[PDB]
Design a protein around this ligand. Structure first.
Ligand SMILES: Nc1ncnc2c1ncn2[C@@H]1O[C@H](COP(=O)(O)OP(=O)(O)O)[C@@H](O)[C@H]1O
Ligand SMILES: [Mg+2]
Ligand SMILES: [Zn+2]
Ligand SMILES: [Zn+2]
Lengths: 70, 426
């Protein structure tokens, strides 16, 4: 149906692109949390891939299973 | 705290058991059983903290242990509790009124403990990368025993690190809230765990310290310079009401302490009149007063008094009386002093010292130990024998012998009328 030529260009535009936000992209604050447990009290970026962790246990967990670039 | 040997170094406590009954010889104290029992009662009152504005008078003949008793009370009371010891002659100042000096002394003996919870990151630095405006982009890496992560800095943290000029490979401490940086040497020592730790730091201050801190723009220097000045009473009232509010909130606790005036027989009638009322109010510490004179004229007054103190103050105080020692107690006190001074006395030497102390004075025999040790060392002898003590006795005179010599030769000294016969002839 989407690929069908019967759906006109402006119809597709209004049905999919127009309904999405176009002006206000982020009005709330940006909150960064631990990639492993979502904590926020302490935050630091892993040396290898630049993703955030919060504690020694989360450090070990990320290194053992989550680290992508290594 | 390195220091030389004093005259009260051996007294490491009050020497009581669980039932407050003092042992014959413990913690460096000998004898004075009832005095030590009463001092233990006072110490328990101080530790309880529920009783305020009590004055205890430590009266008795000289060389009986009043200052020793106070020192034992202070040591058994330990640290983490204020203990202000001022001589009665320290009140008279050219910058502070006597009432103001007494007030400052009273406030110095009431402590306030304030707990501050700080978030500080401690670890071994590895790399620091700071770049120019593209305001500032910066990354620091802190290694510990089990973590190694990078931190994305901000403007003020970058400015602080540049100001400190932290190198690499050195243990560093950074506070998240305050922003203070404490440097440490290269990791003897090493980081011990998580990067960001939660440890509380407790600050012990007195009411006087808070008063002086709020007295001026930078009043906390006056706690060392001593130019506090007479603080306004409204400031003290503010401190008092805020301490009450903090205690109610539970964010600060009060540790009542002991104020010791060693020579109360020097304070004037105005000081005693002030003390009478200062004891009544809350936040009043426990005042210990040491006096020796039996009946004397109170300074500033023309009449005698039961201890040199006005009757109004004596009504408000409980009196602990100390009694003169006997031969055996003198012997064991001298043994303790000799052990403290690292002097190995012989049995006969100790007996001679004990008999000399009983005949003349305990302090005189206590002072002769070091002189006897030096005399023996001139003979290349280790132990101090009888003849060394005899030579010390011959070379150094006590009060009675000096008085006898002055009386028998009153012409060659200057008398009260200002007369002397310098000429050896006629
Ligand atoms: N009960 C005691 N136990 C141990 N040492 C004592 C005792 N009483 C007095 N002394 C010693 O005697 C010396 C003088 O005592 P001091 O404190 O001056 O008494 P006072 O102040 O009444 O003259 C001190 O160096 C102290 O070590
Ligand atoms: Mg004394
Ligand atoms: Zn986590
Ligand atoms: Zn990673």
């Amino acid at each position: 149906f989407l690929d069908s030529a019967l759906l006109n260009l402006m119809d597709k535009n209004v049905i999919y692109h127009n309904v999405y936000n176009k002006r206000y992209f982020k009005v709330l604050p940006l909150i960064t949390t631990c990639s492993i447990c979502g904590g926020y009290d302490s935050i630091s970026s892993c040396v290898n891939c630049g993703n955030k962790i919060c504690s020694v246990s989360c450090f070990k967990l990320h290194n053992e299973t989550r680290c992508r670039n290594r | 705290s390195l220091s030389l040997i004093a005259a009260h170094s051996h007294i490491t406590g009050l020497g009581l058991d669980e039932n407050l009954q003092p042992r014959p010889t413990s913690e460096g104290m000998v004898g004075q059983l009832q005095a030590r029992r009463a001092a233990g009662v006072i110490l328990k009152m101080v530790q309880n903290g529920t009783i305020a504005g009590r004055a205890v008078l430590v009266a008795g003949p000289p060389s009986t242990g009043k200052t020793a008793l106070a020192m034992g009370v202070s040591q058994s009371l330990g640290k983490d509790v204020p203990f202000t010891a001022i001589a009665g002659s320290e009140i008279f100042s050219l910058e502070l009124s006597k009432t103001e000096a007494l007030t400052q002394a009273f406030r110095k003996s009431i402590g306030i403990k304030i707990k501050e919870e700080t978030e500080l990151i401690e670890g071994e630095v590895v790399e620091i990368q700071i770049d120019r405006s593209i305001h500032k982009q910066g990354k620091l890496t802190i290694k510990t025993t089990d973590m190694e992560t990078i931190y994305e800095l901000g403007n003020k943290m970058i400015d602080g690190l540049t100001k400190e000029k932290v190198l690499a490979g050195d243990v560093i401490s950074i506070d998240k809230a305050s922003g203070k940086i404490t440097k440490l040497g290269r990791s003897v020592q090493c980081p011990e765990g998580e990067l960001q730790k939660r440890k509380t730091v407790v600050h012990t201050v007195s009411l006087h310290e808070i008063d002086v801190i709020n007295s001026r723009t930078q009043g906390f220097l006056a706690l060392f310079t001593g130019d506090t000045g007479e603080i306004r009473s409204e400031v003290r009232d503010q401190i008092n009401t805020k301490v009450a509010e903090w205690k109610e909130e539970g964010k600060a606790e009060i540790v009542p302490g002991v104020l010791f005036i060693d020579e109360v027989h020097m304070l004037d009638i105005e000081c005693f009149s002030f003390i009478n009322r200062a004891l009544e109010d809350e936040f009043a510490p426990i005042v210990m007063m040491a006096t020796n004179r039996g009946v004397s004229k109170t300074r500033g007054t023309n009449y005698k008094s039961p201890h040199g103190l006005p009757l109004d103050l004596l009504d408000r105080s409980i009196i602990i009386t100390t009694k003169s020692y006997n031969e055996q107690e003198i012997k064991t006190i001298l043994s303790i002093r000799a052990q403290e001074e690292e002097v190995e006395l012989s049995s006969d030497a100790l007996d001679l010292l004990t008999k000399t102390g009983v005949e003349t004075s305990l302090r005189y025999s206590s002072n002769l130990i070091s002189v006897a040790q030096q005399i023996a060392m001139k003979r290349k002898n280790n132990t101090v024998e009888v003849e060394d003590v005899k030579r010390a006795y011959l070379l150094f005179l006590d009060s009675a012998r000096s008085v006898k010599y002055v009386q028998e030769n009153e012409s060659q000294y200057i008398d009260d009328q200002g007369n002397v016969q310098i000429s050896i002839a006629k």
